[PDB]
Amino acid sequence: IRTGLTDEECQEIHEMNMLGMHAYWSIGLIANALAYAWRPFHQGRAGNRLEDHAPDYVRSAL
Amino acid sequence: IRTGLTDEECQEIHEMNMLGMHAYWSIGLIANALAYAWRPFHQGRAGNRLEDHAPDYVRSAL
Amino acid sequence: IRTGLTDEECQEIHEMNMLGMHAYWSIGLIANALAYAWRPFHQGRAGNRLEDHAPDYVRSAL
Amino acid sequence: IRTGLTDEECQEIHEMNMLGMHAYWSIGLIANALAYAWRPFHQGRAGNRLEDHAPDYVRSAL
Amino acid sequence: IRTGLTDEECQEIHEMNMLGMHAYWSIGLIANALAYAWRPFHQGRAGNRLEDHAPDYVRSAL
Amino acid sequence: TGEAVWLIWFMAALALIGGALPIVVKWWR
Amino acid sequence: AMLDFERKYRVRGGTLLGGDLFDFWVGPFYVGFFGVTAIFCAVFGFLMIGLKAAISETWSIFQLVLAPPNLENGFALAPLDEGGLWQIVTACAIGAFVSWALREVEISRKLGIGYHIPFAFGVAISFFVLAQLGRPLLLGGWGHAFPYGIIAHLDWVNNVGYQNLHYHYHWAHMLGCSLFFATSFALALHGGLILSVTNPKKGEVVKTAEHENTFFRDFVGYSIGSLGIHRLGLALALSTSISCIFGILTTGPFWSRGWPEWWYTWWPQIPIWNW
Amino acid sequence: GDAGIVVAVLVILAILGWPNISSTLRRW
Amino acid sequence: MWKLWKFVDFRMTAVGFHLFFALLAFAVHFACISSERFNWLEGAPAAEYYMDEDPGIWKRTSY
Amino acid sequence: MWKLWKFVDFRMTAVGFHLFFALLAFAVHFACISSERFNWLEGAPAAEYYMDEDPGIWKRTSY
Amino acid sequence: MWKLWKFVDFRMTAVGFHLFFALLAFAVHFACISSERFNWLEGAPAAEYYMDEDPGIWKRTSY
Amino acid sequence: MWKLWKFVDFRMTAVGFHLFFALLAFAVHFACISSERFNWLEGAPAAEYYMDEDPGIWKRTSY
Amino acid sequence: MWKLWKFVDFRMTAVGFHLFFALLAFAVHFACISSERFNWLEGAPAAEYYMDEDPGIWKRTSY
Amino acid sequence: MWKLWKFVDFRMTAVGFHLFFALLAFAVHFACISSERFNWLEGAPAAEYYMDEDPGIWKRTSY
Amino acid sequence: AEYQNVFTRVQVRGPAEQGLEVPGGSWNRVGRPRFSYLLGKIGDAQVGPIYLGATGVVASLGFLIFCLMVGFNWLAAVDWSVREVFRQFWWLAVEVPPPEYGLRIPPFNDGGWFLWGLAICSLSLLMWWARTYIRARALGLGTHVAWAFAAALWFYFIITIIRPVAIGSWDESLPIGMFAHLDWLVAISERYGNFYYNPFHMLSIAFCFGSALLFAAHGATILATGRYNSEREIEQITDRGTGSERAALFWRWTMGFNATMESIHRWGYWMAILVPLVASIGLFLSGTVIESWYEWGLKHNLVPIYEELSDPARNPAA
Amino acid sequence: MDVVDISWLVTLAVLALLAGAYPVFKRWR
Amino acid sequence: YRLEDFAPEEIRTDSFYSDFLPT
Ligand code: A1LZM
Ligand code: A1LZM
Ligand code: A1LZM
Ligand code: A1LZM
Ligand code: A1LZM
Ligand code: A1LZM
Ligand code: A1LZM
Ligand SMILES: C/C=C1/c2cc3[nH]c4c(c3C)C(=O)[C@H](C(=O)OC)c4c3nc(cc4[nH]c(cc(n2)[C@@H]1C)c(C(C)=O)c4C)[C@@H](C)[C@@H]3CCC(=O)OC/C=C(/C)CCC[C@H](C)CC/C=C(\C)CCCC(C)C
Ligand SMILES: [Fe+3]
């Protein structure tokens, strides 16, 4: 069943939706880039556990 | 029972449905290729358990 | 909202209200003054704990 | 939504409300000044704990 | 979806709302300034835990 | 570690419920 | 074998699943496909209960139990002599309860009434499912679910309650016991009110809704009314089943100490009176 | 290395998918 | 405030005030019974019995 | 705020304020009772009794 | 925001804000109480009493 | 399958697929987190870090 | 996909997306908090601090 | 997005945003309280107070 | 979806109905009828007026006296600290006399306060039951509500008086406390075997679970058939409509048997009031006839026997 | 912060949210 | 045809009846 919106209403809704989704998408991508440059999310083969790299006196929650 | 949708409305829905399904599908394939190159999902006959390849001092949750 | 009471009705309600409130207030002030003379309500800077002024054998509920 | 009270009714309600609020406010301010002169509500940098200023034999509820 | 309030009713509600909001805001800013001058809210790099600055006999609730 | 390990999935269940709430309400109405 | 007014409503349609093949009545019972599946699950589960009675040599409805597997079994399929029969009967009971509720949905559709009855039954079924699935998922095995014995599941209730020392003090138990007591209280009040209105002393005329309203207004100051009493009753019984869900899903999974200690953990330390 | 590439890709995606730039590809 | 009864029900106000004051008299008498100094039912001594000087209330007494 | 009663029920506001102030007077008195310094029912000493100088509030004193 | 009352009920907004701020004042006062530094009811010393220098807030102090 | 929408509601299909894919993304991310090899949040090493040869997937490796 | 709103309700979709994204932002921030590496609230060191070389992500490193 | 209020109730949106932001402000303040580095009420020191150099955030520091 | 008859979305208000004429109603009906919109969502919005009868007023006064006795005892137990009363609200209780008194009324602080409060509470409950009866009778109603309360009160008197008297000890009676009376539950069940093995406990739980079942099912039935004005059940009893017919046919097609609009209330009334009645029977037999429900059900092949434990605990006292 | 203190603070926060939302929930139709 | 009646004791034979409910 149709929602009832005209083509123009759908177009303006889509303009707002593209703005919202793509603005959120770009801000989130910048945020994920910043968090990744701060600490990359994926560990690599060596891992990133402190117990595997830090000295024995560095406490690790793991 | 039908849905009452015209051939044109069904074609518009199919265009959007193909675009959404295949865009997700391709982004998911890229994501799975990235995660597979990061760490292949499926172990070899040797497995990929740390207890079987890493030294004893490497902690494994298994 | 409006109680529907006339100005004279409100005035007689209010004279009774003033009588009740102020008679209770004055009797309570006399009662509080009597209880304050009996034992001042508020401790001095020295306090009024028995443990700080009474001898050791004088039991205090602290 | 509109309460339906006229301007004169709102003005007399406000006179009574101003009287109640400000009489309570002034009586409470006098009460707080009296209690503050009795014992200042807020400690200085030294605090006002008995454990830090009273002798050892002065018991404190901590 | 519309409250039905007229132009002048909305403006006078806004006058009262601005009065209440900004009076509370200013009184609260003065109150927070007073409490901040009494004891600054945010610790410096040294912190302000009593354990880290007071002598040992000064008990702290941590 | 801590209690966030299950908090991820409690919030995930809440997110699924919240995303479905307008759907369920529109279906209801 | 059919009510004086029953044939007037015995029409085709209203099936969720079954079409006209299962859309009939056997005696008083409407069948439907969900009636067929409910009978299947019920009879097969009772035959598995009888199988456990045979293998355990326990031909007593009171002493016979189908207990879930051991805790060490986890979620694994158990031997039929080691909890597998309980797993089969758990599937059978879930299927029979769901089929019964769906048959009631079919009957409600056929009668044009709301689905409130299968919904309330589904709330009870949800308790059973969350107790026999949610508690195993929380605690890591089918062995934490209650067994199928008339008396032995009472022993399981006893032991699971005493695992937390004093189960009365459980907050969900306190709320749910209050809700069961309120449900019996309100059922007594409501049955009594309706019978009092329609059965006054001999020689008195049948009273009205005004009479019952003013009765509870005179009695306790509030009358919830004809619609309100049934809404409150459905709410009370449903809410007691949700309280049962919370109780069975929290004792152990979310508090392994005594419920007395649970109450001591927060209530006495509430800062408004902890000084 | 790899992290820098990931950050660069995410930034490029954010720039390209920004409404001002992504909308230029709007066709209706 | 005689016009308060044009807008505020006096019966409600008076009944509520009497009920709250019954509860408040109970609460305050309870507060006195809780206090060792003020519990006449237990009848404990006052510290002023053993003081050699007036403690005051606002007096800037020092140990 | 004299126009507030064109939009906000004054009876509701006054009744709710009196109820909340009853609750708040109780809560604040109980907060004082909880405080050893301020519990007049227990009557503990003030630390100013044993202090030598004025502690101040914003005085920026030092040990 | 003077047109906000064309779409949002001011009675609702004001009542909700007053209730929320009542319980938020309760919460914030209790947060001060829970803090040893800020509990005026217990009146603990401030660390600045035992500090030789001003701790600062944004001041980049070092041990 | 453009004709599927003559017979199956697209709104229902797409809404259900989005709900189920949100649920399945949660479930799959949980599956990765539950895997030590794949938990990026805990960041365990890969076993390939400690192998002298590529394990492969279909490679007929022998001990 | 401007034609989607001919069939799928935009208000329902946007409200669902916003509720889902609020609770999912909570979930993802909790995923970060659950991670020792990523918990900014506890501020643990990164293993890259104690590593003499870049761990990489897809880089085939060996022990 | 001024046309959003043609399709989404602004009162619903604004009220829900204020509710969710009160909830999220509480949640974030509790997250700061949970953090020893950020619990202003407990007032713990900053690790930077003891560091000899700037830790950075994105700075590629080595032990 | 369809309207679920869960909440009244649109409430209508008439004039506040003082109530149907009863002897003494004009004077004894007190309180300006107040309309709760929140209560109107579910049922009737009107709150009040309440009948200020002699039995009702004195029963409420006795309930207040009992509650204040309990509160004063709790205060004196925590050194008259309301703060400590609220801190220990659930634990605090007016404790029953110890066994060394048997049926003697002891001093106040050795369980005498409990017996005093038991007398006050029992008399107040009997006056409230009389109010139930008289309020029903004044309106030309049956006393079914009074007799449901009588069943509950019979169980209460078994718990508090009759069964402690038959056992010959007041310590068997129910302590007046939140957690204390639950502790009484534990103590009674474990002292006398196990009430899980008490068949009247079984039946009372069957009737309580079935009160929940019937009252869920009946409320759901009425809300489902409210499309056909089935909630006006008095009319459906005197003038059986399609709502009552549909309810009966739903339950006949489900269970094979149904009730009527009146007989469902008979069913629910009896299922409810059976909880306290068979409850009283089982509790009374616990400690008078039955010493252990576990041993008794062992004799009756009622108690399950489980797998013998590997390495059972052996009683060191032989 | 003490677990009882933070839990009571969360309780007061939840109460504040409920009290602020109550006029909202009353008029939510 | 009970296996315990014909097989040697090295063959594990489990009775049809279980001892789970010694009633
Ligand atoms: C006849 C007639 C009459 C009347 C009348 C009237 C009118 C018209 C009015 C009034 C009022 C009134 N009051 Mg009244 N009255 C009477 C009485 C009385 C009494 C006795 C008992 O006697 C009393 C005690 C009374 C009190 C009162 C109060 C409540 C009020 C207010 C004030 C204020 O606000 O200030 C005040 C103000 C201000 C601003 C202040 C503030 C704070 C806030 C919260 C705070 C918060 C805080 C917190 C929460 C925290 C704490 C912490 C701790 C740690 C915890 N009354 C008579 C009966 N009237 C007002 C109002 O309401 O408002 C709205 C008005 O208008
Ligand atoms: C020592 C220990 C102990 C205990 C234990 C415990 C635990 C563990 C628990 C519990 C419970 C509780 N409980 Mg009890 N108890 C105690 C006691 C008591 C008392 C007194 C007086 O004392 C009271 C009154 C009480 C009650 C109660 C409530 C409330 C609850 C129950 C109910 C149920 O659940 O069911 C629920 C259930 C249900 C829902 C069911 C459903 C069917 C299904 C679908 C249907 C169908 C089926 C079928 C068979 C068909 C038939 C056929 C024909 C026949 C043909 N408590 C002690 C203490 N606890 C739960 C809960 O939590 O809740 C909350 C749980 O979990
Ligand atoms: C460690 C980690 C990991 C992961 C990760 C993640 C996350 C986080 C997520 C995901 C996902 C997803 N995935 Mg994946 N993964 C994984 C694996 C996998 C697999 C396997 C094989 O294993 C598959 C098949 C998948 C797939 C997928 C989809 C289904 C979804 C969507 C996307 C797409 O679309 O793409 C796109 C699509 C795709 C990729 C698909 C394709 C087919 C193909 C042609 C064929 C197939 C084959 C087979 C199965 C056989 C092999 C195996 C052997 C043994 C050799 N994943 C890992 C384990 N994830 C998502 C979801 O769920 O949402 C809803 C999310 O969130
Ligand atoms: C120890 C003891 C004590 C007390 C005591 C009591 C009792 C018993 C009672 C009371 C009260 C009351 N208060 Mg008080 N206090 C206290 C303090 C205080 C404070 C502080 C800060 O500290 C405040 C702010 C108050 C305030 C008040 C009010 C609100 C009311 C009154 C009313 C009026 O309005 O006037 C009066 C009013 C008033 C006073 C208000 C004013 C502001 C001003 C401008 C400003 C402020 C400032 C700030 C906040 C900042 C801080 C600083 C520092 C350095 C940090 N309180 C102490 C602690 N009480 C009441 C009530 O609640 O009612 C309901 C009662 O009952
Ligand atoms: C110790 C103690 C204490 C306190 C205390 C108290 C009490 C008792 C009370 C209060 C209050 C209140 N506050 Mg406060 N505080 C505190 C702090 C604070 C803070 C921080 C950050 O720190 C804030 C922001 C506040 C704020 C406030 C408000 C919101 C309210 C209202 C008032 C007003 O309006 O003001 C007004 C306002 C105001 C003052 C403010 C606003 C913005 C500004 C410009 C800027 C922003 C910035 C930021 C956020 C960040 C910084 C950084 C750092 C470095 C990190 N508070 C402390 C810690 N309290 C009240 C209430 O809540 O009621 C409801 C009460 O009662
Ligand atoms: C440590 C920390 C962390 C984080 C953080 C956070 C917080 C706090 C938050 C967030 C978020 C968010 N994210 Mg992120 N992260 C992370 C990671 C990640 C990932 C991975 C991969 O891992 C992903 C994919 C993400 C993504 C996202 C989104 C989806 C959202 C939104 C944003 C947007 O929209 O834009 C943005 C978007 C984006 C970025 C997306 C992208 C795609 C691409 C191209 C494709 C795919 C690929 C793949 C998967 C590959 C794999 C790798 C390997 C394994 C090597 N995240 C970390 C772990 N967060 C949010 C939320 O949720 O809200 C609701 C929040 O709050
Ligand atoms: C033992 C010990 C004791 C007592 C005792 C008792 C009993 C038994 C009773 C009582 C009462 C009562 N009080 Mg008293 N007290 C006490 C104190 C007090 C106070 C303080 C301050 O402290 C106050 C303010 C009072 C007051 C009162 C009233 C409000 C009520 C009512 C009455 C009347 O009206 O008067 C009348 C009124 C009156 C008296 C009042 C007036 C204003 C004034 C000038 C002003 C204010 C000031 C201030 C607050 C300052 C602070 C101080 C410092 C800290 C230095 N109380 C002690 C603690 N009782 C009652 C009742 O509640 O009823 C309901 C009762 O029963
Ligand atoms: C909050 C709401 C509630 C609610 C509501 C409500 N319950 C309804 C309806 C509505 C609206 C119905 O509409 C429906 C009905 O038709 O009768 C009126 C029904 C019903 N419930 C029954 C039993 C009931 N219900 C209880 C609790 C509530 N019932 C809560 C309080 C309780 C207890 C313990 O409290 C009991 C024993 C049946 C009589 C009937 C289902 C028949 C069935 O499932 O068919 C299926 C037919 C059969 C024969 C089922 C057999 C299935 C397996 C294989 C047989 C083995 C049984 C088990 C494994 C269960 C565990 C054994 C214990 C010893 C551990
Ligand atoms: Fe009924």
Ligand nearest to the CA of J33: 4
Say whether residue L2 is in contact with chain M using an 8 A CB cutoff.
no
Report the alpha-carbon distance of residue O29 to residue D50 in Å, rounded.
59
Q: Residue D8 contacts by C-beta under 8 Å, 6 or more apart in sequence?
A: none
Pairing of strands O176-177, O93-94: antiparallel
Report the C-alpha gap between L48 and B38 in whole angstroms.
11
- Interchain contact N51–A (C-beta under 8 A): no
Q: Give SS3 for O93.
A: strand
Strands (E), D1-62: none
Residue P24 — φ and ψ, nearest 5°?
-65, -50
Count how many Cα atoms sit within 13 Å of the Cα of residue O23 in the half-sphere of its side chain. Answer: 6
- Name the DSSP letter for residue G22: S
Residue E10 token pair: 């909305």
* Nearest one of J54, J53, J32 to J43, comparing CA atoms: J32
Three-state SS for O317?
coil
DSSP N1-56: -GGGGGTS-HHHHHHHHHHHHHHHHHHHHHHHHH-TTT-TTTTPPPGGGT-SS---
Asked if E45 and K62 come within 8 Å (Cβ–Cβ), the reply is yes
Longest dimension (CA), chain D: 67
Beta partners for residue O93, in sequence order:
O177
Residue type, E26: S
CA distance O290 to O299: 12
Query: What's the rounded Cα separation, in Å, for the pair G275 and C58?
Result: 25
Q: Are the beta carbons of I47 and C62 closer than 8 angstroms?
A: no
Strands O50-51 and G29-30, by their bridges, are unpaired
Q: Which residues of J touch D48 (CB under 8 A)?
A: 37, 46-48, 55
**Do L48 and B36 form a contact (C-beta atoms < 8 A)?**
no
Maximum Cα interatomic distance, chain K, rounded to a whole number of Å: 58
Q: How far is CA J47 from CA C43, J28, J44, O245, in A?
A: 13, 22, 9, 81
> Do residues G122 and G108 make contact, with C-beta atoms less than 8 angstroms apart?
no
Could you tell me the sign of the dihedral formed by the alpha carbons of L16, L17, L20, L25, in that order? Answer: negative
Question: What resolution (Å)?
Answer: 2.4
**CA H8 to mean position of chain CA atoms:** 10
Q: Do chains B and E touch (3 or more CB pairs under 8 A)?
A: no
Q: How far is residue C53's CA from residue C55's CA, in Å, rounded to a whole number? A: 7
Structure tokens at F18: 């919240």
The experimental method is cryo-EM
Residues of I in contact with O80 (CB under 8 A): 30, 33-34, 39, 41
- The burial of G40, by beta-carbon neighbours within 10 Å (0-12 exposed, 13-18 middle, 19 or more buried), is given as middle
Considering only the beta carbons, identify the residue of E5, E38, E59 that sits closest to D51: E59
SS3 (DSSP) at G65: strand
Burial class (CB in 10 A: 0-12, 13-18, 19+), G80: middle
Token representation of residue G235: 């709410």
Beta carbons of G275 and J27 less than 8 Å apart: no
Q: What phi, psi does M37 have (nearest 5°)?
A: -65, -35
Whether there are 3 or more C-beta pairs closer than 8 Å between J and N is: no
| Interacting residues of O200 by C-beta distance below 8 A, sequence separation 6+ | O278, O279, O281, O282, O283, O285
Between CA G105 and CA G33 the distance in angstroms is: 12
How is residue G255 annotated by DSSP?
B
Lookup: tokens for N16: 């829900």
- Tokens in use for G246? 């919370």
Yes or no: say if J57 and E38 are a contact pair by the CB < 8 Å rule: yes
Q: Facing residues of O50 across strands?
A: O30
Phi, psi of O176 (to 5 degrees): -90, 85
Is O144 annotated to bind ligand? no
Q: Which residues pair with E20 in a beta bridge?
A: none
O218 in a known ligand binding site: yes
* CB–CB contact H3 A37 (8 Å): yes
Return all residues near M22 (Cβ < 8 A) that are at least 6 apart.
Answer: F15, F18, N20
Element (H, E) at G148: strand G148-149
Burial class (CB in 10 A: 0-12, 13-18, 19+), M7: buried
**Cβ atoms within 10 A of the Cβ of G215, count?**
27
Phi-psi region of D44 (alpha: psi -120 to 50; beta: other; left: phi over 0): beta
Task: Name residue G222's beta-bridge partners.
Answer: O47
Q: What is the DSSP string of O2-53?
A: ---SSS-SS----S----S--TTHHHHEESPPEE-HHHHHHS--EE-PEE--
DSSP designation for G222? B
- Which chain D residues touch K9 with a CB distance below 8 Å? 1
Degrees, nearest 5: CA angle O46-O51-O52? 130
* CA gap O237, O224 in Å, rounded: 17
Residue pair G161/G251 in contact by the 8 Å Cβ criterion: yes
Question: How far is residue D41's CA from residue D38's CA, in Å, rounded to a whole number?
Answer: 9
Q: Decide if O240 contacts O249 (C-beta within 8 A).
A: no
- Residue type at E47 in one-letter notation: G
- DSSP state for residue P24 in the 8-state scheme: H
Residue ranges of E strands in G49-119: 65-66
**Measured CA angle at O132 (ends O127, O138), to 5 deg:** 115
- Are the C-beta atoms of E45 and K33 separated by less than 8 Å? no
Whether residue M50 contacts residue N63, with contact meaning beta carbons closer than 8 Å, is answered with yes
Instruction: Output the CA angle J20-J22-J28, nearest 5 degrees.
Output: 95
Length of chain N: 63
Angle K10-34/J10-34 helices, nearest 10 degrees?
Answer: 0
Is residue M25 within 8 Å of residue N21, measured between CB atoms?
A: no
- In this structure, the number of other CB atoms found within 10 A of the CB of residue G30 comes to 27
CB–CB contact K19 P13 (8 Å): no
Contact criterion met (CB below 8 Å) for D44 and J61? yes
Cβ–Cβ < 8 Å for F2, M36 = no
DSSP 8-state secondary structure symbol assigned to residue G251: B
Dihedral (Cα; L39, L40, L42, L47), 10-degree rounding: 70
Q: After which residues does chain N become discontinuous at a C–N distance over 2.5 Å?
A: none
Q: What is the spatial distance between Cα O85 and Cα O76, in angstroms, rounded to a whole number?
A: 9
Give CA separation, I61 vs G79, I56, J38, O63, in Å: 84, 8, 17, 51
Nearest to G132 by CA among G66, G62, G207, G55: G66
Residue E61: how many other CB atoms lie within 10 Å = 15
Report the relative pairing of strands G148-149 and O29-30 from DSSP bridges.
unpaired
The Cα-based distances of I37 to E16, F20, I52, I55 in angstroms read 49, 62, 18, 14
Q: After which residues is chain L broken (C to N over 2.5 A)?
A: none
CA O62 to CA O65: how far, in whole Å? 5
Evaluated on CA atoms O194, O199, O203, O204, the torsion sign reads: negative
Q: Would you call G26 helix, strand, or coil by DSSP? A: strand
State whether K57 and E46 contact (CB < 8 Å).
no
CA dist C18 → C10, G78, I2 (Å): 12, 82, 9
Q: How far apart are CA I62 and CA I55, in angstroms?
A: 10
K26 contacts chain G (CB < 8 A): no
M42 touches chain H (CB under 8 A): no
Evaluate the omega torsion of the peptide bond into residue O49 and state whether it is cis, within 30 degrees of 0: yes
Q: What angle do CA G158, G160, G164 make, to 5 degrees?
A: 105
- Contact: L41, M31; criterion CB under 8 Å: yes
Q: Ligand 2 centroid vs G180 CA: distance in angstroms?
A: 10
CB contact residues (below 8 A), chain M span 4-63, against chain L: 7-9, 20, 27, 31-32, 34-38, 47, 60-63
Could you tell me the two tokens for O3? Answer: 């309207």
Query: Tokens at residue O161, please?
Result: 């008086």
Read off the tokens for P6: 């933070």
Query: In chain D, what residues touch E48 (CB-CB under 8 Å)?
Result: none
Chain L residue nearest residue A1, CA to CA = L9
Helices M10-34, L10-34: inter-axial angle, 10-degree rounding: 0
**Cβ neighbours around E27 below 10 Å, total:** 10
d(CA N43, CA K32): 12
